[PDB]
Ligand binder design. Structure first.
Ligand code: CLA
Ligand code: CLA
Ligand code: CLA
Ligand code: CLA
Ligand code: CLA
Ligand code: CLA
Ligand SMILES: CCCCCCCCCCCCCCCCCC(=O)OC[C@H](CO[C@@H]1O[C@H](CO)[C@H](O)[C@H](O)[C@H]1O)OC(=O)CCCCCCCCCCCCCCCCC
Ligand SMILES: CC1=C(C#C/C(C)=C/C=C/C(C)=C/C=C/C=C(C)/C=C/C=C(\C)C#CC2=C(C)C[C@@H](O)CC2(C)C)C(C)(C)C[C@H](O)C1
Ligand SMILES: CC1=C(C#C/C(C)=C/C=C/C(C)=C/C=C/C=C(C)/C=C/C=C(C)/C=C/C2=C(C)CCCC2(C)C)C(C)(C)C[C@H](O)C1
Ligand SMILES: CC1=CCCC(C)(C)[C@H]1/C=C/C(C)=C/C=C/C(C)=C/C=C/C=C(C)/C=C/C=C(C)/C=C/C1=C(C)CCCC1(C)C
Ligand SMILES: CC1=CCCC(C)(C)[C@H]1/C=C/C(C)=C/C=C/C(C)=C/C=C/C=C(C)/C=C/C=C(C)/C=C/C1=C(C)CCCC1(C)C
Ligand code: SF4
Ligand code: SF4
Lengths: 73, 173, 92, 80, 137, 30, 33, 147
């Protein structure tokens, strides 16, 4: 939601990191993307892809995930 | 009976040892669900009366390692840690009972040639007392109550503790 | 005492005593070099043991003559012990 | 075990039988070759698959073939 | 038949001998007569002294037994070596000189096993023997 | 922005899909 | 009970319990007569 | 002279050596719980676990991630308990897989014998870890390694 505003400046985050082996330096080093917890920055381009498709809110992505779970079932 | 036999056919490994959908599994899960309803009532009491020390204090990452850090940049509270350790006590008791059961107690994993207990059915006979029937009735009731409590909490929006208190009539707190 | 399945071994401690004396008595030979002080190897080892027992919990420091004296004395003692067992059991 | 087979191109040289570290191949009587003998594989359960029989074979492509199949203790040559 | 009272070639012992699999599954034996006391090489490793007369030896593998037999036949001139297989039941079997004569020379009585009535070029194709019980021969 | 109720609905659908996956795995194993 | 606790509740499960149970059950299955 | 065939069997895959067949070696091995005579498979496991959890507590306590913390000893004990549970699971799966249900009268090579052994090992291991935890928590020498 904060990437669709300034996509050329915001780094897209893939998912959060929860590793009980990280030290405080590692947590601080990985806390980026404007979030407040260690994260991975996506390199798959799914952000750009979905933005182009027409996804704007997190609710759109959540609805898509629900539909794909239903389709897998 | 038909379901039990077809499961025994499908998964001989679990059914032969008593695991899976069996009367033994039903009895054990009823035991655990009754103990869990009691645990929920006790935690409701303690939280309402403030008996949990430093309940809202966030555990220090420097002291308790990275495990003290939660998923989204949050910290586990002292109350959550205390309740988790309370569960750890009974979990160690559980592992010890499963691996080295008392001679008189029922065993979690039944022997290969064990005789399954008769499936009670809709309701076992009403044998009032400390009897294998009353145990099963109350275990089924407690398991159903656990599911009902969770679903009431999610639907009505109240906490599980709040729902338990409301049901009991606010006697707990 | 059987050293193997059916082979007996005497295991005489007098062999140990004799080998210890055989290595230690020559060790008394004094030397004026700093390592020994003025005394021999065995006497220097005894003196170091006493000195570092007086300061019990602090190990002899690296560079102290104690370590070198210990190593040399025990190398010679073990060599003499092996030779004495050889003599007592094969040439005995 | 491995499947060992013999074909009519056999000339009865017997080198396949002599080369086998086990005792899997033996000479039997035959009329299709000048030597009057043909190789046979009665004890195929003892075969290890070394293909020494195949190596010691003089006919254009082998008269004896070893097809490696299911593995057992004897086939794998496991002394333990 | 095998006589279990035949002495052994006064071996000094080794770590290459048979193991628990010999007591559990199969243990092979080889018996041979020697005209004098020679020194031979164990198939497991090391040297042993064969006795004047009958010698019985225990091994874990038929290949080891037959390697020892080949050594006796070539290095020495001993060709009366017999090989047996013993199960834990004690059911000794006779294997090597099966028909009393070595397989390298034809003998009347043997039945051909595994013989095919064409060259290898006449084998069928897996496509032809697919989804069928036919054999590629 | 994604609520706990939304995550719970997702988890329920995931559990249904897991049950169906176990069924398919059994049917394929046969 | 918020969603922020789910990572800490699950990662140990998915990474130590699920693998341990799967390995034990698979061991029992593969070594079974 | 000192190295001979094992059990006077020249063709077994073993040699009789001082380390393998000396009087001290035989006495030690025969007096260890795994071999002592008379012990039930449960008592063998009890002694072995008592011995093993005790030394398990130390490495975790003095080299674990929370070793420079106030909770180093409790963390070490809890990691010891976790490893003990994992090893008890290993023992249980090994017993169910290796030993069939035939009854050889609790010889430690039976289903029942191994079940008793693993139960005793779990109990003794947890007990020994707890005993080491108590001793370390109450004795300064053990907390400082003599410093
Ligand atoms: C959250 C509450 C809860 C609790 C406390 C339990 C507890 C239990 N359930 Mg379960 N159960 C639950 C919810 C719960 N259940 C629900 C919602 C359902 C669906 C209706 C079931 C359905 C169900 C069935 C059908 C059966 C059980 C059984 C059991 C027992 C063993 C399960 C097990 O070992 O899992 C453990 C899994 C974990 C993730 C936790 C393990 C943590 C410990 C400390 C680790 C040590 C494990 C131990 C060493 C074993 C290792 C084995 C491996 C190496 C092979 C146990 C009394 C079985 C039973 O009673 O058998 C007689 C059985 O057959 N349950
Ligand atoms: C992906 C999953 C995963 C998870 C969730 C963890 C979690 C952990 N690892 Mg890591 N680890 C992993 C994979 C994982 N590891 C892998 C793949 C390796 C191999 C390279 C390691 C190797 C490793 C080492 C070498 C060490 C850790 C340690 C730790 C701990 C973090 C540091 C700390 O202060 O804790 C320590 C504080 C504690 C209070 C520990 C309590 C742990 C309890 C007892 C766990 C419960 C176990 C359970 C009952 C077993 C069930 C068995 C069943 C499945 C059969 C933590 C328990 C450190 C540690 O201390 O481990 C004990 C440590 O030294 N890990
Ligand atoms: C001791 C070394 C160590 C260990 C044990 C771990 C452990 C972990 N790291 Mg890693 N990490 C390490 C060093 C280590 N890290 C280092 C040095 C760095 C650099 C700073 C990182 C950086 C890092 C990041 C940035 C992230 C992690 C993540 C994770 C977690 C993975 C989540 C999970 O459980 O997935 C489960 C494990 C897998 C899916 C991997 C599966 C791979 C195997 C080989 C597949 C096996 C397939 C098999 C055929 C079938 C299954 C069999 C089985 C069920 C029996 C886990 C706790 C991630 C995390 O927190 O996720 C929540 C994450 O985002 N780590
Ligand atoms: C977090 C999960 C969890 C929880 C909360 C419990 C809770 C309990 N288990 Mg355990 N149990 C669990 C997981 C869990 N179990 C698992 C995964 C298994 C499979 C190994 C078991 C297997 C198991 C067995 C086989 C037994 C228990 C028993 C118990 C009780 C121990 C404390 C007690 O008796 O207090 C109340 C009693 C006094 C204070 C006295 C309690 C109902 C024991 C029990 O019911 O004893 C009464 C028991 O026999 N559990
Ligand atoms: C280090 C001390 C030492 C040394 C060098 C020797 C040397 C000798 N002893 Mg021995 N011996 C020793 C201590 C020693 N002994 C002790 C402590 C005892 C008492 C238990 C005996 C008791 C004893 C007896 C009873 C006999 C010997 C004899 C011998 C000879 C046997 C062969 C041999 O050992 O080759 C080693 C010789 C070498 C030259 C190797 C040099 C290797 C360098 C250092 C490297 C040889 C001269 C026999 C004898 O008198 O032979 C004439 C004899 O009968 N010794
Ligand atoms: C296949 C897609 C996928 C992948 C690769 C991951 C990966 C991850 N999820 Mg998961 N997750 C997924 C789908 C997926 N998720 C879905 C659809 C949901 C909604 C129900 C979730 C909900 C979810 C939550 C709530 C959390 C994670 C977390 C995690 C992390 C640790 C693993 C874990 O705890 O899983 C736990 C997963 C579940 C309890 C349910 C989802 C399980 C999926 C559907 C299994 C799919 C299997 C796949 C199709 C086939 C397997 C192939 C086989 C060869 C192994 C890791 C980054 C945790 C974390 O720490 O994140 C940072 C965490 O807190 N996930
Ligand atoms: C049974 C051993 C444990 C295997 C469990 C494997 C799950 C781990 C991932 C597996 C990856 C796919 C390979 C699985 C091949 C299975 C081999 C086999 O023998 O299976 C055997 C089992 C069934 O085997 C059962 O065996 C019985 C005898 O004991 C009888 O034969 C039953 O008929 C038969 O159903 O196969 C399946 O049921 C597999 C189910 C499909 C996997 C479910 C999805 C798991 C994915 C992880 C879930 C995420 C959790 C969060
Ligand atoms: C609480 C708690 C704990 C706990 C716990 C535990 C162990 C909780 C365990 C809970 C369990 C096992 C719950 C199982 C519920 C099953 C239900 C509701 C089935 C319903 C079936 C129906 C309606 C049906 C039906 C049907 C109909 C209509 C007619 C039939 O002819 C057909 C059909 C079958 C389809 C612990 C111990 C962790 C402690 C913690 O501090 C708190
Ligand atoms: C004391 C003690 C212990 C103990 C203990 C024991 C033995 C504890 C036992 C606890 C039990 C039996 C709890 C049952 C709870 C049932 C509920 C919440 C049912 C809800 C039903 C509903 C909502 C039904 C709804 C239904 C209705 C009304 C009508 C029909 C339809 C529908 C709407 C679905 C221990 C073990 C902890 C040890 C301790 O040292 C001592
Ligand atoms: C969330 C909530 C709300 C209120 C009530 C309730 C108690 C339900 C509560 C709790 C819910 C819980 C605990 C839900 C748990 C969620 C779980 C276990 C999610 C996991 C889902 C896993 C999935 C899809 C796995 C899919 C795997 C697949 C295809 C594998 C494919 C296959 C493979 C790999 C081998 C061959 C067979 C097959 C099937 C083709
Ligand atoms: C080989 C060698 C060479 C040089 C000399 C050296 C000595 C180092 C030697 C090596 C020696 C070695 C390796 C020694 C190691 C010793 C070890 C690991 C000893 C372990 C002792 C264990 C002890 C007390 C355990 C005590 C446990 C107790 C009460 C448990 C009690 C309990 C139990 C079991 C269950 C219920 C709860 C309760 C009552 C608490
Ligand atoms: S070698 Fe080839 S040809 Fe000569 S005998 Fe053996 S099989 Fe027949
Ligand atoms: S493969 Fe080795 S064993 Fe099998 S037959 Fe050819 S040679 Fe004899």
């Amino acid at each position: 939601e904060q990437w669709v505003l300034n996509p050329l400046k915001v780094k897209p985050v893939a998912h959060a990191i929860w590793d009980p082996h990280f030290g405080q330096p590692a947590v601080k080093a990985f806390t980026k993307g404007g979030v407040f917890y260690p994260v991975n920055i996506a390199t798959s381009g799914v952000y750009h892809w979905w933005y182009t498709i027409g996804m704007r809110t997190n609710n759109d992505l959540y609805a898509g995930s629900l539909f794909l779970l239903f389709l897998s079932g | 009976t038909n379901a039990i036999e077809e499961f025994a056919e499908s998964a001989p490994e679990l059914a032969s040892r008593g695991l899976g959908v069996t009367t033994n599994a039903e009895r054990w899960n009823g035991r655990h669900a009754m103990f869990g309803i009691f645990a929920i009532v006790m935690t409701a009491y303690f939280k309402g009366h403030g008996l949990i020390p430093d309940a809202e204090k966030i555990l220090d990452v420097n002291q308790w390692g990275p495990l003290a850090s939660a998923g989204q940049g949050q910290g586990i509270t002292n109350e959550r840690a205390i309740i988790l350790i309370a569960h750890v006590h009974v979990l160690v008791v559980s592992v010890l009972a499963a691996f080295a059961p008392f001679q008189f107690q029922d065993t979690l994993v039944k022997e290969k040639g064990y005789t399954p207990e008769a499936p009670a059915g809709i309701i076992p006979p009403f044998k009032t007392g400390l009897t294998p029937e009353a145990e099963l009735i109350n275990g089924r009731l407690a398991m159903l109550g656990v599911i009902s409590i969770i679903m009431a909490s999610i639907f009505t929006g109240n906490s599980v503790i709040d729902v338990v208190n409301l049901g009991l009539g606010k006697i707990l707190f | 005492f059987e050293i193997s399945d059916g082979v007996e071994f005497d295991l005489n401690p007098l062999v140990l005593a004799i080998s210890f004396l055989g290595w230690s008595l020559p060790g008394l030979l004094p030397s004026n070099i700093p390592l020994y002080g003025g005394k021999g190897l065995t006497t220097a080892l005894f003196a170091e043991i006493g000195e570092h027992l007086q300061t019990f919990p602090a190990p002899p420091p690296i560079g102290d003559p104690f370590w070198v004296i210990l190593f040399i004395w025990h190398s010679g003692l073990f060599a003499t012990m092996i030779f004495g067992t050889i003599g007592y059991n094969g040439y005995g | 075990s491995h499947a060992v087979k013999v074909y009519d191109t056999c000339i009865g040289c017997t080198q396949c039988v002599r080369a086998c570290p086990c005792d899997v191949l033996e000479m039997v009587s035959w009329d299709g070759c000048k030597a009057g003998q043909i190789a046979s594989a009665p004890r195929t359960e003892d075969c290890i698959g070394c293909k020494r029989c195949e190596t010691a074979c003089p006919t254009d492509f082998l008269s004896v073939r070893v097809y490696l199949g299911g593995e057992t203790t004897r086939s794998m040559g496991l002394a333990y | 038949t095998l006589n279990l009272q035949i002495p052994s070639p006064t071996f000094e012992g080794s770590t290459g001998g048979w193991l628990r699999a010999a007591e559990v599954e199969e243990k092979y034996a080889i018996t041979w007569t020697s005209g004098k006391e020679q020194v031979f090489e164990m198939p497991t490793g090391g040297a042993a002294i064969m006795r004047k007369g009958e010698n019985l030896l225990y091994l874990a593998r038929k290949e080891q037994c037959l390697a020892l037999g080949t050594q006796l036949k070539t290095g020495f001139k001993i060709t009366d070596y017999k090989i047996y297989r013993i199960f834990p039941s004690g059911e000794v079997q006779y294997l090597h000189p099966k028909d009393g004569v070595f397989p390298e020379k034809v003998n009347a009585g043997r039945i051909g096993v595994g013989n095919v009535s064409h060259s290898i070029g006449k084998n069928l194709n897996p496509s032809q023997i697919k989804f069928t019980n036919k054999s590629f021969n | 922005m994604i609520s706990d109720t939304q995550i719970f609905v997702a988890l329920i659908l995931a559990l249904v899909s897991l049950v169906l996956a176990i069924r398919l795995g059994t049917a394929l194993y046969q | 009970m918020t969603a922020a606790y789910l990572p800490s509740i699950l990662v140990p499960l998915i990474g130590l319990i699920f693998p341990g149970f799967v390995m034990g059950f698979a061991f029992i299955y593969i070594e079974q007569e | 002279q000192f190295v001979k065939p094992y059990n006077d069997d020249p063709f077994v895959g073993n040699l009789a050596t001082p380390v393998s067949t000396s009087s001290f070696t035989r006495s030690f091995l025969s007096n260890l719980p795994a071999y002592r005579s008379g012990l039930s498979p449960l008592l063998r496991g009890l002694e072995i676990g008592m011995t093993h959890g005790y030394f398990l507590v130390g490495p975790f306590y003095k080299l674990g991630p929370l070793r420079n913390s106030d909770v180093a000893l409790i963390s070490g004990l809890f990691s010891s308990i976790g490893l003990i549970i994992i090893l008890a699971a290993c023992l249980a799966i090994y017993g169910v897989v290796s030993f069939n249900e035939d009854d050889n009268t609790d010889s430690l090579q039976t289903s029942r014998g191994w079940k008793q052994f693993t139960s005793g090992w779990l109990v003794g291991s947890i007990g020994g870890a707890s005993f080491a935890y108590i001793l370390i928590s109450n004795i300064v020498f053990l907390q400082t390694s003599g410093l």
